């Protein structure tokens, strides 16, 4: 089976009233459903006795209540280990102090397991359902560490990693000195954090920072420590600041990974892509960095190795739009469609950004017959479009001279939450009323303009006084005339005076032609009466046209004389 | 027992006793009559005695661009919510009690002279 | 008073008559009028009346439909399941030949019911 293009994603309720009608509702509907799940779990865990009868065979461990409280109330080591597994930072510290004051021996492995908990969360309680630098100066972790009787390599490593995690870069480098003075050897994970601290500790020029990092790496070779993927990924992530200076050094890191045997992940190329994609002219370098990155990744199935693997596709598409290369974008999308690579697209914000840049590049550089196939395959099945992609789509229909689709784009626009977007309705009306068309098309444009007019009238801004742009009124009026709905056009002329919007010259001239057809002198005067209010120069010349073209009754002649008096 | 409970419609149909040998021949008269009341009228889904604030059900889902978390009204503010619901209940009762009277006819108990309004509009958009 | 919410048109109106239907109903699912592009009606009609339409039709919801098991889907499903099957020995052409080589028969029964256990 393949994706159903007429449907919204499977997570939503397949019902016309409950289906998301916009990108905003797509995000909020799932958050409301997750909120309901959280409320149920909160209740299940708060009142577990109601949910303890197990009638399932085989047993389902994942449908039983969770117990987050320690069940050992004795003061001993084996009771502390329970509070550490439950990740109770305060209870574990209190139990550790009392246990220490009593004078009982607490093992080293357990003391380290207590630091790993404090150093990770920073002496703070992890989030629960319901009851700058963050390395607090007064922190239990450093105290327990000092009071510690015997300290092994692992003890320092968990302190150095926690400091860097919480942005205590300067403290972590100072602690890395003691580790060396004590003839100890750190691990790769400690070195990964120290590389992050070396760059973020102080602001310096690239050459100074690039000399320290190479010193950490050489130290890592002296201590017989082998670098992992995150070691090289941290270097590339930290060189993002220097941009142009780090472009060639960053490519030296990538070539080193290949030789050593570490395999670049999606994150390794995301960091290189972001480093080279600096504001400027990308053609000089960014062109051949992305073309070589995709030839390497062509037809490769990816597995999660780095936390930043879910950012490559969003980054790679961002350059394809900048370069305006549609062949490259298809290769990027082709990689996303091989095997299970589609799961690396990222969160909803990254999914909508990727498809916005992808589709906006299709509408621009692709044939309109293929563009409308992607429009059907992606929207709403893959993502809900932003109002700027609806506009980018109309600009593509115009360039293709296929304007019979405009009424469909307005119908779809409403179904995607763009009924009351001003930039969109103006764009639709301007294209429809830009030029005259065969009678069949002109009638279709007038049924759409009518539906747009209704949107302007019934806006949610109706709480405020209704605001009609000048272009919208001119276009909607012209479309009614060209369709033969003259009655509707004449009624609208009042709205030019009510909202004080200047009538367009083209609209006034087409009104005169509709009068000469109906041979109605009063309406023709109503036109000259309108242009006279705004003091348009065409009016004085138009009054001459009205005289000759239409029979002027004595009352009408005096009325023109009154306007002539104004002249 | 939870399984012995019935719906409001079942409970009112029994309690009101509008169908029966009493109501068949008006064998029973009603100076004091049980009156049906809709008890779901002013009730908001998600509102309970404990005063919990469920994001997306009884409070907004997002606040300041971030998803709200489970919270519970404090005793003082929950107490004011309950009081406000009681006043809204007696207020709703008071408004219903107020009704506009109609002018009598030739006499207080006579139908003669009372206006019935215009005849109903005919099927073919006819009006009187 | 803010505007009330409008239900979208049924997505059957966007379906092409040459679509891949198994993608619409890939697995067993309840009948959905907005997703099934068929003017199917169910219900004993009232006198001089028609069977009720599919929208809000509980009788069509009560049916264990086979929309996920169309002949097109079954044939595609089994083409993917052929890789999981093994070949019966050709030498065992008849029951008498099986008895000769395999004289013991073991009978066991599996029971599929609906429920938690």
């Amino acid at each position: 089976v393949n994706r159903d293009t007429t449907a919204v994603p499977y997570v939503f309720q397949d019902d016309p009233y409950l289906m998301p009608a916009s990108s905003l509702e797509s995000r909020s509907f799932l958050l409301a459903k997750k909120s309901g799940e959280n409320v149920a779990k909160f209740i299940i865990n708060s009142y577990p006795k109601y949910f303890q009868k197990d009638i399932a065979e085989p047993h389902i461990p994942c449908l039983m209540p969770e117990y987050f409280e320690p069940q050992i109330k004795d003061i001993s080591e084996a009771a502390l280990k329970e509070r550490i597994e439950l990740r109770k930072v305060k209870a574990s510290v209190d139990m550790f102090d009392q246990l220490l004051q009593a004078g009982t021996t607490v093992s080293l492995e357990t003391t380290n397991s207590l630091l790993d908990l404090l150093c990770y969360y920073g002496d703070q309680e992890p989030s629960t359902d319901y009851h700058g630098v963050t390395w607090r100066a007064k922190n239990n972790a450093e105290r327990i560490f000092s009071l510690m009787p015997e300290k092994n390599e692992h003890s320092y490593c968990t302190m150095i990693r926690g400091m860097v995690k919480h942005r205590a870069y300067e403290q972590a480098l100072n602690l890395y000195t003691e580790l060396l003075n004590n003839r100890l050897h750190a691990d790769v994970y400690t070195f990964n954090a120290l590389i992050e601290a070396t760059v973020c500790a102080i602001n310096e020029k690239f050459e100074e920072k690039w000399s320290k990092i190479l010193e950490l790496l050489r130290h890592m070779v002296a201590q017989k420590v082998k670098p992992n993927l995150q070691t090289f990924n941290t270097i590339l992530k930290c060189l993002r600041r220097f941009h142009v200076f780090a472009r060639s050094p960053a490519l030296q890191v990538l070539r080193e990974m290949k030789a050593i045997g570490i395999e670049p992940s999606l994150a390794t190329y995301h960091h290189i892509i972001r480093l080279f994609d600096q504001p400027g002219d990308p053609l000089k370098r960014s062109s051949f960095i992305i073309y070589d990155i995709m030839n390497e990744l062509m037809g490769k199935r990816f597995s999660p190795k780095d936390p930043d693997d879910d950012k490559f596709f969003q980054s790679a598409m961002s350059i394809c739009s900048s370069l305006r290369d549609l062949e490259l974008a298809y290769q990027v999308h082709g990689l996303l469609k091989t095997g299970d690579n589609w799961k690396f697209i990222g969160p909803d914000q990254h999914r909508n950004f990727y498809y916005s840049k992808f589709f906006d590049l299709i509408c621009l550089m692709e044939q309109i017959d293929v563009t409308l196939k992607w429009y059907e395959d992606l929207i709403p099945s893959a993502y809900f479009p932003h109002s700027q992609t609806m506009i980018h789509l109309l600009q593509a229909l115009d360039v293709a001279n296929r304007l019979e689709v405009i009424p469909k784009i307005w119908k779809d626009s409403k179904e995607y939450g763009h009924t009351f977007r001003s930039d969109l309705r103006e764009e639709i009306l301007m294209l429809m009323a830009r030029d005259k068309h065969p009678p069949e098309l002109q009638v279709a444009f007038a049924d759409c303009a009518a539906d747009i007019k209704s949107a302007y009238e019934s806006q949610p801004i109706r709480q405020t006084a209704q605001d009609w742009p000048a272009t919208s009124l001119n276009c909607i009026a012209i479309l009614f005339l060209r369709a033969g709905r003259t009655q509707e056009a004449w009624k609208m002329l009042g709205l030019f005076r009510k909202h004080n919007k200047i009538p367009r010259s083209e609209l006034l001239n087409e009104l005169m032609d509709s009068a000469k057809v109906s041979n109605s002198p009063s309406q023709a005067i109503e036109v000259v009466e309108l242009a006279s209010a705004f003091s348009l120069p065409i009016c004085e010349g138009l009054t001459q046209r009205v005289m000759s073209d239409f029979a002027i009754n004595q009352e009408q002649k005096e009325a023109l004389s009154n306007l002539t008096a104004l002249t | 027992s939870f399984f012995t409970k019935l719906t409001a419609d079942e409970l009112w149909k029994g309690a009101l006793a509008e169908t029966g040998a009493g109501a068949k021949k008006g064998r029973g008269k009603r100076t004091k009559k049980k009156k049906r009341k809709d008890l779901n009228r002013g009730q908001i889904i998600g509102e309970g005695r404990y005063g919990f604030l469920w994001p997306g059900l009884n409070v907004p889902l997002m606040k300041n661009g971030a998803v709200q978390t489970i919270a519970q009204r404090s005793k003082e503010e929950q107490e004011k919510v309950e009081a406000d619901m009681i006043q809204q209940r007696e207020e709703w009762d008071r408004k219903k009690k107020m009704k506009v009277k109609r002018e009598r006819g030739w006499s207080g108990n006579s139908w003669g002279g009372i206006s019935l309004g215009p005849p109903d509009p005919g099927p073919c958009g006819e009006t009187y | 008073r803010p505007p009330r919410r409008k239900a979208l048109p049924p997505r059957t109106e966007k379906m092409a008559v040459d679509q891949d239907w198994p993608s619409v109903y890939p697995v067993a699912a309840p009948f959905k009028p907005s997703a099934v592009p068929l003017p199917v009606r169910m219900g004993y009609p009232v006198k001089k009346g028609v069977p009720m339409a599919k929208e809000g039709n509980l009788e069509l919801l009560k049916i264990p439909n086979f929309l996920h098991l169309t002949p097109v889907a079954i044939k595609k499903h089994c083409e993917a399941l052929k890789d999981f099957c093994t070949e019966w020995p050709a030498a065992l052409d008849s029951d008498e030949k099986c008895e000769k080589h395999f004289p013991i028969e073991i009978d066991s029964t599996d029971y599929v019911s609906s429920g938690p256990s």
Partner: peptide, 16 residues
């Protein structure tokens, strides 16, 4: 009857 006997719109896709 004389006592009184008183017992006293637009739709949008993706509304807000």
């Amino acid at each position: 009857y004389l006592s009184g006997e008183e017992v006293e719109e637009y739709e949008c896709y993706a509304p807000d």
